Amino acid sequence: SVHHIKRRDIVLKWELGEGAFGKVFLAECHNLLDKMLVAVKALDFQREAELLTMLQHQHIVRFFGVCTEGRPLLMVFEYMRHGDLNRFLRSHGPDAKLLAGGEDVAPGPLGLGQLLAVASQVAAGMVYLAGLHFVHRDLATRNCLVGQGLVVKIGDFGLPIRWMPPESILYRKFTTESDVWSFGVVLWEIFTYGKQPWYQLSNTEAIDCITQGRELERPRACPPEVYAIMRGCWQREPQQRHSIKDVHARLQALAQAP
Amino acid sequence: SVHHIKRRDIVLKWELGEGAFGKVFLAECHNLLPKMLVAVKALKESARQDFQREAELLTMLQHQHIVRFFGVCTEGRPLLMVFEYMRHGDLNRFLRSHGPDAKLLAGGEDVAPGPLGLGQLLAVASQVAAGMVYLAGLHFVHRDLATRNCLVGQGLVVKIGDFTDYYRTMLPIRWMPPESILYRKFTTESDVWSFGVVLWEIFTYGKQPWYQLSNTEAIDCITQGRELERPRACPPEVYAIMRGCWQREPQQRHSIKDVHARLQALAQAPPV
Numbered sequence: 001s002v003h004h005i006k007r008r009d010i011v012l013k014w015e016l017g018e019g020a021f022g023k024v025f026l027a028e029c030h031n032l033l034d035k036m037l038v039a040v041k042a043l044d045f046q047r048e049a050e051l052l053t054m055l056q057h058q059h060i061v062r063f064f065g066v067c068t069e070g071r072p073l074l075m076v077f078e079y080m081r082h083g084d085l086n087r088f089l090r091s092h093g094p095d096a097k098l099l100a101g102g103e104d105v106a107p108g109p110l111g112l113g114q115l116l117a118v119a120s121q122v123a124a125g126m127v128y129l130a131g132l133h134f135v136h137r138d139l140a141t142r143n144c145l146v147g148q149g150l151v152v153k154i155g156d157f158g159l160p161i162r163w164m165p166p167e168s169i170l171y172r173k174f175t176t177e178s179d180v181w182s183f184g185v186v187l188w189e190i191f192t193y194g195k196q197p198w199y200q201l202s203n204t205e206a207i208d209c210i211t212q213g214r215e216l217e218r219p220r221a222c223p224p225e226v227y228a229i230m231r232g233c234w235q236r237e238p239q240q241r242h243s244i245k246d247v248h249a250r251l252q253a254l255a256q257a258p
Numbered sequence: 259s260v261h262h263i264k265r266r267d268i269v270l271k272w273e274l275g276e277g278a279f280g281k282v283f284l285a286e287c288h289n290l291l292p293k294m295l296v297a298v299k300a301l302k303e304s305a306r307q308d309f310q311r312e313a314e315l316l317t318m319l320q321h322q323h324i325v326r327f328f329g330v331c332t333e334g335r336p337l338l339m340v341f342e343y344m345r346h347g348d349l350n351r352f353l354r355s356h357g358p359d360a361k362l363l364a365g366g367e368d369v370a371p372g373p374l375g376l377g378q379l380l381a382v383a384s385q386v387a388a389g390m391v392y393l394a395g396l397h398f399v400h401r402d403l404a405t406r407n408c409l410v411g412q413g414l415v416v417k418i419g420d421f422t423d424y425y426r427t428m429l430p431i432r433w434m435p436p437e438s439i440l441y442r443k444f445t446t447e448s449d450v451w452s453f454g455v456v457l458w459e460i461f462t463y464g465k466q467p468w469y470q471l472s473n474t475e476a477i478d479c480i481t482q483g484r485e486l487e488r489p490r491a492c493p494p495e496v497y498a499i500m501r502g503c504w505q506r507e508p509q510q511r512h513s514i515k516d517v518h519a520r521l522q523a524l525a526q527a528p529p530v
């Protein structure tokens with residue numbers, strides 16, 4: 001049951017970005033729980049809207065429903081103030097510069113506790129998805145969002161070969177194990193402050209690496225116990241990869257006393 | 259007019275990457291000059307007409323800092339374009355591969371692992387500028403100058419290579435000045451602005467301009483006249499050149515001849 005919202009309630013403020021299938025706006029929304037700030041996507045989709053009303057968890061971006069009074073078609077989510085995880089990582093990071101939100105999260109590297117908190121949070125969402133035998137197919141920092149207080153949530157569902165395991169690239173097999181592999185890559189992105197996997201290489205060269213069994217470099221940040229978790233996710237054989245529940249456990253263990 | 263090559267003379271060795279164009283291969287070519295290694299572009303997908311026009315242009319543009327175009331093959335499919343092999347590939351991933359915490363995977367015996375000498379960076383920037391000088395000579399506008407569109411050969415030689423970085427009719431907005439964004443005006447002065455952004459990429463080891471921001475936020479920055487941060491690398495004298503390229507008014511920007519001259523001076527006697 002999709003919550004339908006009225007147009008008069010949603011007043012657009014400014015545009016945040018432009019994603020795959022249209023504009024994303026910051027908005028005031030009235031009478032949704034008083035007036036608060038939400039993120040509104042724009043221009044079937046009812047299949048997707050039902051899915052998002054189905055998938056509720058602490059670490060999946062809150063979906064508040066749709067507006068299909070007039071056009072174009074609106075999907076209303078919570079405003080995740082800091083935007084996507086990829087650009088947030090990058091905004092902190094060695095030689096970066098923060099352009100806003102420094103009052104909430106300090107300018108500069110995040111350091112081990114905060115990076116482990118980021119990894120944990122993503123993993124928590126993946127545990128939820130594995131619980132429902134749901135396969136993401138595109139887990140990546142660009143598809144996570146970051147709100148007030150450094151709280152991180154899986155942001156989008158639906159090519160991304162550098163995050164995929166060999167069975168997904170060669171055979172198009174997507175499973176909860178191929179998502180675990182991607183989560184290993186997400187760990188790498190977090191611990192490199194948002195570098196692209198195989199940044200050195202063309203798309204074709206990176207497929208060749210992945211399929212020949214070459215492992216992404218250990219990041220300069222990375223403690224050996226964190227790099228171990230990545231390698232847990234990257235076993236050539238799907239069967240042999242750590243479960244996402246095990247991975248979340250380990251991460252939450254490290255996050256206290258890093 | 260375009261040099262045609264026979265297909266039997268081109269033998270593919272391995273794939274290097276896949277562009278918008280189609281696949282790019284390493285190949286041996288015979289009967290091209292006094293057998294040698296080349297890069298062959300293969301046209302995916304008419305775009306027949308986009309190919310003959312592009313091929314004419316590339317025959318037209320001969321310079322030390324434009325990738326050598328050796329011609330086309332139009333017997334058997336797909337349609338091929340044959341260029342010299344630039345061993346290190348494109349400049350953006352070359353830069354990133356040499357970033358402060360990056361990791362070189364090959365070609366270390368030619369260019370050392372790690373960041374480049376200040377003189378090395380300035381030599382890369384001035385090579386790209388030399389290509390742009392040649393183009394501005396011909397009253398030719400690139401429209402998409404960026405490190406991804408430059409190639410890096412053996413001995414750190416850099417040439418203009420091409421003719422998420424893009425925004426939907428696909429505009430590289432992070433490399434564009436306001437008049438290009440607002441009014442679709444592409445000039446030799448808008449290429450200077452882009453050159454400035456390329457200098458910023460060089461001196462950041464391949465960061466995206468406005469990496470902190472969405473496409474929409476970046477357009478807002480650029481049109482409201484905000485300047486890219488000075489890189490930690492960047493000498494004051496180099497950052498000054500960048501700002502010279504980034505004047506809100508096109509009239510007020512450094513000429514590319516100015517910029518080349520100044521960079522060639524710095525490369526010869528690099529600051530701090």
Ligand SMILES: Nc1c(N2CCN(C3CCCCC3)CC2)cc(Nc2ccc(C(=O)O)cc2)c2c1C(=O)c1ccccc1C2=O
Pocket residue numbers: 016017018019024039061077078079080081082083084099100101145155470471472473474475
């Ligand atoms: N907050 C954003 C957002 N941003 C607003 C935050 N903005 C700030 C972050 C603080 C420093 C820089 C400026 C980064 C961009 C862009 C956003 N869209 C983007 C982000 C990046 C790109 C891109 O890579 O170009 C495109 C759209 C979104 C959101 C959401 O909160 C959101 C919530 C729920 C669903 C979707 C979104 C959302 O899409």
Ligand SMILES: Nc1c(N2CCN(C3CCCCC3)CC2)cc(Nc2ccc(C(=O)O)cc2)c2c1C(=O)c1ccccc1C2=O
Pocket residue numbers: 200201202203204205274275276277282297325341342343344345346347348355363364365409
């Ligand atoms: N050499 C390449 C090249 N590389 C070959 C080797 N490779 C690495 C190996 C890893 C470290 C050192 C360089 C980098 C990529 C990719 C190349 N194409 C790319 C580059 C990147 C992508 C991508 O980002 O996916 C796709 C194709 C090319 C070329 C050319 O020499 C070339 C010459 C003339 C015209 C075109 C090309 C060319 O396209």
